[PDB]
Amino acid sequence: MLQYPELPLESPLIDAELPDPRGGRYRLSQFHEPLLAVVFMCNHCPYVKGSIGELVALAERYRGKVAFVGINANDYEKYPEDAPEKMAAFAEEHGIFFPYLLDETQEVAKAYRALRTPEVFLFDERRLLRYHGRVNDNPKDPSKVQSHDLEAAIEALLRGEEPPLKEAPAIGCTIKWRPGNEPEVRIG
């Protein structure tokens, strides 16, 4: 039977409260900017490393308009580069001023039916899902990007328009699930 289907457009924000290794805890529903971009990521994925610059630049450009939140759900026991301490250093190295949260149990990633890094979920003022997928069409190499999908969706929403009708699924490495946490995806 159908299992682990992606979160459909117009689906309400799935709230969660998680800690940021730099200090404090954050609840997804606490951010009150018009738009909210939730990004599942990590510290070592080449797809995240090649697109984090753009993500931070977007967050900077949209301060007060689009709230950004990064979430690392990776099994850091198996992937030390994704440990909480490494998260703080990664945020420092890339100027990630917005919250970068640890999803230790991986239940937030599971609830969002997330599969890769980076994978973005953009919610509107009514906190309904308007865009879900890739940051751009070549996360690993900025010099090869031909479309800035996330930027396009944000700008469309800012103009009161609908983001591109053609779905642009996330491009990146798979989330590193803990033993026994691997999602069983079934198309029917």
Tokens of residue 6, six digits: 């992606």
Query: Which of 161, 150, 141, 176 minimizes the C-alpha distance to 51?
Result: 141
The residue type of 115 is L
DSSP readout, 107-164?
A: HHHHHTT--EESEEEEE-TT-BEEEEE-SSS-TT-GGG----HHHHHHHHHHTTPPP-
Tokens of residue 102, six digits: 């640890």
CA distance linking residue 115 with residue 119, whole number of Å: 8
CA distance linking residue 82 with residue 106, whole number of Å: 13
Answer whether 152's CB lies under 8 Å from 161's CB.
no
Resolution in Å, one decimal, please: 1.9
Task: Show Cβ contacts of residue 124 under 8 Å, excluding neighbours closer than 6 positions.
Answer: 34, 35, 130, 157
Query: What size, in residues, is the chain?
Result: 188
The residue type of 158 is L
* Secondary structure letter of residue 61 according to DSSP: H
Answer whether 96's CB lies under 8 Å from 131's CB.
no
CA-CA-CA-CA torsion sign (6, 25, 21, 83): negative
CA distance linking residue 137 with residue 118, whole number of Å: 12
Q: Nearest-5° angle of CA 98, CA 103, CA 108?
A: 100
CA distance linking residue 91 with residue 51, whole number of Å: 13
How many other C-beta atoms are found inside a 10 Å radius of the C-beta of residue 61? 11
Answer whether 135's CB lies under 8 Å from 49's CB.
no
Rounded to an integer, what is the distance from CA 13 to the centroid of its chain?
13
Set out the domains of the chain in order of their start, with CATH numbers: 2-188 (3.40.30.10)
Answer whether 29's CB lies under 8 Å from 15's CB.
yes
Tokens of residue 98, six digits: 């917005």
Task: Show Cβ contacts of residue 94 under 8 Å, excluding neighbours closer than 6 positions.
Answer: 52, 53, 56
The residue type of 66 is V
